[PDB]
């Protein structure tokens, strides 16, 4: 999985997999690659999460190109089955996006995570 880059590290993934969980609870999570593409085009995404273990990996490799075009941070997590479980579904999710909402109750840590991803990038 050399191309999946930057790949979040074992500590980081919890803070990533943590935030996505509440976002699913609060309906601020867009899940699945195609939904992520929508959010970038409309520019309603804080940042986007991808799974490196995907096969064949390229399917999400279009998302980054759209990401730096829009100056949106992005990061890779090792496991897709882990991601979908965090999304709150019975199927593995390869890509997920957090919806923009400055009035959200989970607002602070999302941007705290966003900063860490920005440093990672």
């Amino acid at each position: 999985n050399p191309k999946a880059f930057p790949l979040a590290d074992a500590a980081l993934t919890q803070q990533i997999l943590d935030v996505v969980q509440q976002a699913a609870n609060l309906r601020q999570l867009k899940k699945g690659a195609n939904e992520a593409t929508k959010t970038l085009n409309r520019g309603i995404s804080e940042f986007i999460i991808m799974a490196a273990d995907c096969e064949p990996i390229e399917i999400l490799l279009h998302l980054p190109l759209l990401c730096e075009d829009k100056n949106v941070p992005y990061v890779f997590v090792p496991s897709r089955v882990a991601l979908g479980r965090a999304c709150g579904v019975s199927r593995p999710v390869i890509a997920a996006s957090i919806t923009t909402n400055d009035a959200s109750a989970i607002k602070t840590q999302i941007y705290a995570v966003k900063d860490k991803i920005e440093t990672l990038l």
Partner: protein
């Protein structure tokens, strides 16, 4: 706002966004069409203190006092050797404003539409109870 309420009560999610994306692009072309005045901070480096004290804007650029104030187009002095019109400028600077005002207004309406439709979504809704969907 009465406009949002009438839009909210009589229009659909499909309609609202399509307008929202049109204005977003047409705003971008408008903003790209518009050019601004510099607020950029800017510093000079000088070799010696005596050179510093005698430093003056006129000498450095080889320009005049009317032109030092003009950072955009400070032509060298050697190079030198409308109320309706200026109103039309302001309309363009103002004409983009209604887009910026309109866009947040349409953005607000879309958000309310999404919030209601999410509420109509089939879920636990204890605030949603943590329940994995099958």
């Amino acid at each position: 706002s009465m406009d949002q309420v009438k839009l909210l009560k009589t229009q659909d999610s499909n309609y609202v966004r399509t307008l929202r994306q049109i204005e977003l692009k047409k705003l971008e072309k408008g903003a790209k069409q518009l050019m601004f005045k510099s607020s950029g901070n800017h510093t000079i480096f000088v070799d010696s203190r005596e050179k510093m004290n005698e430093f003056t804007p006129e000498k450095f650029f080889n320009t005049t006092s009317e032109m030092v104030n003009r950072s955009e187009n400070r032509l060298t002095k050697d190079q030198l050797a409308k109320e309706s019109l200026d109103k039309k400028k302001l309309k363009k600077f103002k004409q983009v404003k209604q887009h910026l005002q309109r866009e947040t207004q349409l953005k607000q309406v879309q958000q309310r539409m999404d919030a209601q439709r999410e509420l109509l979504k089939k879920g636990s809704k204890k605030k949603w109870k943590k329940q994995r969907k099958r």
